[PDB]
Scaffold this active site. Sequence first.
Site, PDB file in Angstrom:
ATOM      1  CG  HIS A  80     -13.777   4.060   7.481  1.00  0.00           C
ATOM      2  ND1 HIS A  80     -12.698   4.770   7.010  1.00  0.00           N
ATOM      3  CD2 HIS A  80     -13.272   2.917   8.011  1.00  0.00           C
ATOM      4  CE1 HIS A  80     -11.599   4.092   7.238  1.00  0.00           C
ATOM      5  NE2 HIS A  80     -11.913   2.956   7.833  1.00  0.00           N
ATOM      6  CG  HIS A  82     -12.380  -0.001   9.773  1.00  0.00           C
ATOM      7  ND1 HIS A  82     -11.823  -0.149   8.517  1.00  0.00           N
ATOM      8  CD2 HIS A  82     -13.291  -0.989   9.892  1.00  0.00           C
ATOM      9  CE1 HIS A  82     -12.371  -1.183   7.913  1.00  0.00           C
ATOM     10  NE2 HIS A  82     -13.248  -1.724   8.734  1.00  0.00           N
ATOM     11  CG  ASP A  84      -8.104   3.499  10.959  1.00  0.00           C
ATOM     12  OD1 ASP A  84      -9.066   2.718  10.897  1.00  0.00           O
ATOM     13  OD2 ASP A  84      -7.547   4.038   9.974  1.00  0.00           O
ATOM     14  CG  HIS A 143     -11.020   1.031   3.486  1.00  0.00           C
ATOM     15  ND1 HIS A 143     -10.069   0.070   3.755  1.00  0.00           N
ATOM     16  CD2 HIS A 143     -11.399   1.528   4.695  1.00  0.00           C
ATOM     17  CE1 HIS A 143      -9.845   0.023   5.057  1.00  0.00           C
ATOM     18  NE2 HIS A 143     -10.628   0.907   5.636  1.00  0.00           N
ATOM     19  CG  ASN A 174      -8.585  -6.519   7.275  1.00  0.00           C
ATOM     20  OD1 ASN A 174      -8.062  -7.024   8.270  1.00  0.00           O
ATOM     21  ND2 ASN A 174      -9.746  -6.928   6.811  1.00  0.00           N
TER      22      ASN A 174
HETATM   23 ZN   LIG Z   1     -10.715   1.212   7.651  1.00  0.00          ZN
HETATM   24 ZN   LIG Z   2      -7.489   3.053   8.030  1.00  0.00          ZN
END
Ligand SMILES: [Zn+2]
Ligand SMILES: [Zn+2]
EC number: 3.5.2.6
Length: 221
Positions: A80, A82, A84, A143, A174
């Site tokens: 995904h 994000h 990280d 998520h 989050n």
């Molecule tokens: Zn994420």
């Molecule tokens: Zn993550």
Amino acid sequence: TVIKNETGTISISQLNKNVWVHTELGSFNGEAVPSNGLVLNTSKGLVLVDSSWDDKLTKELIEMVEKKFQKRVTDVIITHAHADRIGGIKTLKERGIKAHSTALTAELAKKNGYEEPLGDLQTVTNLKFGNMKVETFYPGKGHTEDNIVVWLPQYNILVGGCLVKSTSAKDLGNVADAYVNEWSTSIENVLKRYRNINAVVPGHGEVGDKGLLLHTLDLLK
Ligand SMILES: [Zn+2]
Ligand SMILES: [Zn+2]
Ligand SMILES: [K+]
């Protein structure tokens, strides 16, 4: 079997003969948030599931595994958009490392001002690297909008990514980008598709099993 960088910063733990987890500490205000992906040791090169928090960690991670397994990183699957997961996409692109993603993940990356991964993954995509078989599956929103899982049919190992909460996560974390009314359904779609699972890798925290999926469902209640 566990190997740390010079620093604490980066660790790799062996799951089986040609499969390891990679873990990196991101530095956030009062400090360390660890993130997991996978390293696949294949006969045609190293394949990663996910990069890391930023470019500096991503470089160091590639350089550790290339040295250790004595082959190049050729491919990465981004699960995904994000930081990280996609933080080191710049490093990937500039080194000639193929960065696979669904088109939604790629759209979101561009929207958030990251360099674009390939947008080549469908809802179900089957890849083969050397002898190593890999399936990517988009189960639905959870998520995030775009989150995907990765399956190694030869080992029945599921990379849950950030869709799947570890036993130590006592809340969803989050959820700014999350879809908490569909996340249960997405988890169910994973359980329906992969009915015999040997290990589940969450995006953050300890490796577990099918119980992590049930943990995440409980978390959504
Ligand atoms: Zn994420
Ligand atoms: Zn993550
Ligand atoms: K096989």
